[PDB]
Design a protein around this ligand. Structure first.
Ligand SMILES: CC(=O)N1CCNC(=O)C1
Length: 121
């Protein structure tokens, strides 16, 4: 149907916008602490602590499969990256501090993205 196509154009465009948002958020992680899944080889007990792991590479996989239906779903995963890190790692670690900085700097990007998603529809 024509409607299904129109919908898919919208989703494709959302994906385009979220790909840009994702790139802007990952720039705020120059150390690449959040680039890849936490290694279950190097942190064998990780899943005992963190029930829903997340990382930028995993987000990008879902993104390119057009698996984010709205901005809220995307934000949920970004929040997982931060929140997981701030629980597993103590306050006085480079890991925890990197998550705080990513959260704070990412807020700007996500504030504008919300306006844009609403604006474009
Ligand atoms: C993201 C995170 O929290 N990590 C990844 C590296 N290894 C760790 O122990 C902690």
């Amino acid at each position: 149907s024509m409607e299904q196509v129109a919908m898919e154009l919208r989703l494709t465009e959302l994906t385009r916008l979220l790909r840009s948002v994702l790139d802007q958020l990952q720039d705020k992680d120059p150390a690449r602490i959040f680039a890849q899944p936490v290694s279950l080889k190097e942190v064998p007990d990780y899943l005992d602590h963190i029930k829903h792991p997340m990382d930028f590479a995993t987000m990008r996989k879902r993104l390119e499969a057009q698996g984010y239906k709205n901005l809220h779903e995307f934000e949920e995963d970004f929040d997982l990256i931060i929140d997981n890190c701030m629980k597993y790692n103590a306050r006085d670690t480079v890991f925890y501090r990197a998550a705080v900085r990513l959260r704070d700097q990412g807020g700007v990007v996500l504030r504008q993205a919300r306006r844009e998603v609403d604006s474009i529809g």
